[PDB]
Design an enzyme around this catalytic site. Sequence first.
Site, PDB file in Angstrom:
ATOM      1  N   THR A   8       0.824  -1.211   0.000  1.00 12.65           N
ATOM      2  CA  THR A   8       0.000   0.000   0.000  1.00 12.65           C
ATOM      3  C   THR A   8       0.861   1.265   0.000  1.00 12.65           C
ATOM      4  OG1 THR A   8      -1.942  -1.010   1.069  1.00 12.65           O
ATOM      5  CG2 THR A   8      -1.643   1.376   1.363  1.00 12.65           C
ATOM      6  N   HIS A  22      -6.714 -11.137   0.483  1.00 13.27           N
ATOM      7  CA  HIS A  22      -6.036 -10.662   1.683  1.00 13.27           C
ATOM      8  C   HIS A  22      -6.801 -11.163   2.904  1.00 13.27           C
ATOM      9  CE1 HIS A  22      -3.698  -8.457   4.405  1.00 13.27           C
ATOM     10  NE2 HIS A  22      -3.709  -7.256   3.850  1.00 13.27           N
ATOM     11  N   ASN A  73      -3.039  -9.794   8.254  1.00 15.76           N
ATOM     12  CA  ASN A  73      -2.727  -8.486   8.843  1.00 15.76           C
ATOM     13  C   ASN A  73      -3.862  -7.731   9.530  1.00 15.76           C
ATOM     14  OD1 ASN A  73      -0.133  -9.052   7.983  1.00 15.76           O
ATOM     15  ND2 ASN A  73      -0.298  -7.798   6.115  1.00 15.76           N
ATOM     16  N   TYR A  77      -7.084  -7.374   8.804  1.00 18.36           N
ATOM     17  CA  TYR A  77      -8.210  -6.815   8.058  1.00 18.36           C
ATOM     18  C   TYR A  77      -9.445  -7.706   8.218  1.00 18.36           C
ATOM     19  CZ  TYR A  77      -4.708  -3.542   6.977  1.00 18.36           C
ATOM     20  OH  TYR A  77      -3.729  -2.589   7.097  1.00 18.36           O
ATOM     21  N   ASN A 105      -2.958  -4.619  13.687  1.00 17.32           N
ATOM     22  CA  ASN A 105      -4.387  -4.335  13.818  1.00 17.32           C
ATOM     23  C   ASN A 105      -5.090  -5.164  14.883  1.00 17.32           C
ATOM     24  OD1 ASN A 105      -4.396  -2.243  11.940  1.00 17.32           O
ATOM     25  ND2 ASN A 105      -4.585  -3.663  10.210  1.00 17.32           N
TER      26      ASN A 105
END
Lengths: 399, 399
Positions: free
Chosen positions: B37, B191, B194, B196, B251
């Site tokens: 990103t 994805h 991480n 999300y 996260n």
Amino acid sequence: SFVKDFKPQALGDTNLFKPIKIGNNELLHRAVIPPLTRMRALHPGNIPNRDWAVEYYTQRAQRPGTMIITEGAFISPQAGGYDNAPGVWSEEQMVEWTKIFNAIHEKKSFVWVQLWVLGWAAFPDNLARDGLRYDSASDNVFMDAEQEAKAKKANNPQHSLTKDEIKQYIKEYVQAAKNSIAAGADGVEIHSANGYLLNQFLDPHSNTRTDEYGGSIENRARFTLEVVDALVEAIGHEKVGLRLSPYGVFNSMSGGAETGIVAQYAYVAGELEKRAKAGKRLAFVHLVEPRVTNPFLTEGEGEYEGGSNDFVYSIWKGPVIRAGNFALHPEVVREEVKDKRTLIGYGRFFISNPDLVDRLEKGLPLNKYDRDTFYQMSAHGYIDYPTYEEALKLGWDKK
Amino acid sequence: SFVKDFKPQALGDTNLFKPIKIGNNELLHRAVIPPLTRMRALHPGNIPNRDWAVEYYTQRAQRPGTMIITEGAFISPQAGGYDNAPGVWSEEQMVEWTKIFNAIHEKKSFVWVQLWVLGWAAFPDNLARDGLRYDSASDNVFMDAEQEAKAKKANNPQHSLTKDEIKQYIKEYVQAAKNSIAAGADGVEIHSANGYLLNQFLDPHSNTRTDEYGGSIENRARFTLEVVDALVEAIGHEKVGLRLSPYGVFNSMSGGAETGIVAQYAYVAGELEKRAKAGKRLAFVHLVEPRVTNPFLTEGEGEYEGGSNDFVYSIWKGPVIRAGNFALHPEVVREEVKDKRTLIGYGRFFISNPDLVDRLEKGLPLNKYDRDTFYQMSAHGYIDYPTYEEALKLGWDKK
Ligand SMILES: Cc1cc2nc3c(=O)[nH]c(=O)nc-3n(C[C@H](O)[C@H](O)[C@H](O)COP(=O)(O)O)c2cc1C
Ligand SMILES: Cc1cc2nc3c(=O)[nH]c(=O)nc-3n(C[C@H](O)[C@H](O)[C@H](O)COP(=O)(O)O)c2cc1C
Ligand SMILES: O=C1CCC=C1CO
Ligand SMILES: O=C1CCC=C1CO
Ligand SMILES: [Mg+2]
Ligand SMILES: [Mg+2]
């Protein structure tokens, strides 16, 4: 005679000869005697052999500080089904076990009773004779056709355990463990491996139940963890170990063919570590390696190469005993014991070498084992294997 | 300038430079550009940067046969929440993506679109402004207090997804993947890492649901495997990969602190292998290593030593991309690529070295990266990092 093509390597300079505390026991080396069924127990009553068992365990306790896990011992008649394996439910039995534990302790070694429940590996005709169920997790899947046949023939068809009968087993596990400790054992090992009853609940091939004891990873593990919890409560976490064989196919378990199998065993390991952080860490986890998926195949056969037990180490942070074809591979042991919480079970070669620890320490030749007397009702192939000294006197180096 | 204390090692003599087929793509080396990103997408509309994106991806596609996974791309407005990350739902977006894919293909490299859904990592105020929910698995546990605050402040409290809204996401995943392929991508990466949304369902800390999407290993994995299945159906298994970070704490995921975490990820791996034997093997599994539990910590920080990703290899038998602090550790890569199905993702150093593959091959010095421009709206720190040739001309060896 000695193992002909073996190139021994001394292991005295490795962690195999560093002391370690397992439960309440101060081991002086990390070569462990894994559970080894020898079928010398007497019938009727599944009584430890009154003529030979003490001497057998005495010979193998001869290196001070050795951890010995006994041959599988039935927790109850219903848990049994082999006339010549010992039990730990009756006074008759415990009297003989006490003599055994005393002799091992006099040699300054240690003894853990393996608690054994057969499930579908039991002989249904023996059970039928004694008025007992032929038990497993489910009733629509069988160990092999022969065992399915014997059940129907003996009018003792494979029976899916009800929740109350499972509780009854747990009660029997509890009493058997109390009996073991009271008679003088240092601890117990819960046999949840090699396709016996608890394994039959763990494995999705043998467990097709739809109640809370099957149908999912957590459910299939339920029976095993309940036993663990009942025993930790009964006699303490420091006196309890668990045996598992994630890649085993013995007694028709799935092994690596089952894609969910690592997840099944990882979950069990997780739950043990969970209890360990909450103050109740088991003495050890005992793992059968994919090196041996069947210990009645000669060393090097039935090796599964598609999987490793290393995953357990990322999850369980306590002692790990590893077993399977290590005696003929000191080059492998040398690497594995670099991990500081790893112990090595040596099975078949502890059968044939009472002085195995000395031979490992010094890189001495190994006595060949005799598979024909693994399960015989005989002193021969049981208590007459020579120490290295005796072997030399017998001229074994010149055969 | 160059990384000051680095002792480069040429890797051209390792499997890192052996060709491999991933999905339909014939990679000529195994150094992969993982999803990165960069926040250069333009607002409104989450449009790939019309000034710089083509050049950025062109520079990094310069070594023929390179596999490139794009920066995370939102599948829908509701899946988003960062104004400067790109999406793949609108015609406006796909027009810019097509130019990007074309440029990468002209350099004879390959491009996989990472499909991204933020869940609780989204900015609730941005979402509220656009009339969108602030979504996660549950509503009684929050990423951090700040994010919980912003939600309440923006009158956009964290919302536990209903089964219909989950289905809607799956539909959006399907359409986004179709859009990607139609525009010219070689494939997509789901994805599920991480921290999300999908990860928020996988992790027992963030997922406290009691319906079929939580409460157990199988349930927590449900959403992820449904996406996998929907995409394999939509565009084919050979065009679908999955990203996972079993030990990640980014996260607010649990990481190794959760004793059941390996079991959670082992189950996912098992289910993938299950589909693989049934004829539908994903192109790859992409793993973030415990070497990096947070990629905004400097290399060597936030390393988890209590766990390994090696367990996945006992379960999933396909290609594995591994990412995390490999650029500064060629001694590690040399060992890991001895496995013949292992690829290496290089993140931060592909940001700062457009010619990274050449530099790995030849053991050349590496450009230092500039963290300050990881997320900036600028060509600087994006497309102005020099190749080794350009760096020499700029005198970087004498700084
Ligand atoms: C004759 C024999 C009896 C065994 N009995 C038991 C047993 O009662 N309980 C158990 O858990 N494993 C039993 N095993 C498995 C062993 O403990 C061990 O895992 C296996 O022999 C592999 O180790 P090895 O290669 O050193 O022999 C037995 C193995 C053999 C050969
Ligand atoms: C600036 C930056 C942006 C990233 N963006 C993504 C992303 O969009 N999706 C993703 O899965 N990982 C993303 N990552 C994680 C990386 O793909 C990679 O796993 C991480 O940088 C560790 O690899 P490294 O040590 O080689 O940099 C990002 C990392 C960084 C530093
Ligand atoms: O587990 C047991 C008990 C008797 C034989 C085996 C195989 O490992
Ligand atoms: O996964 C992502 C997307 C943006 C940053 C990260 C960390 O790995
Ligand atoms: Mg002589
Ligand atoms: Mg110069």
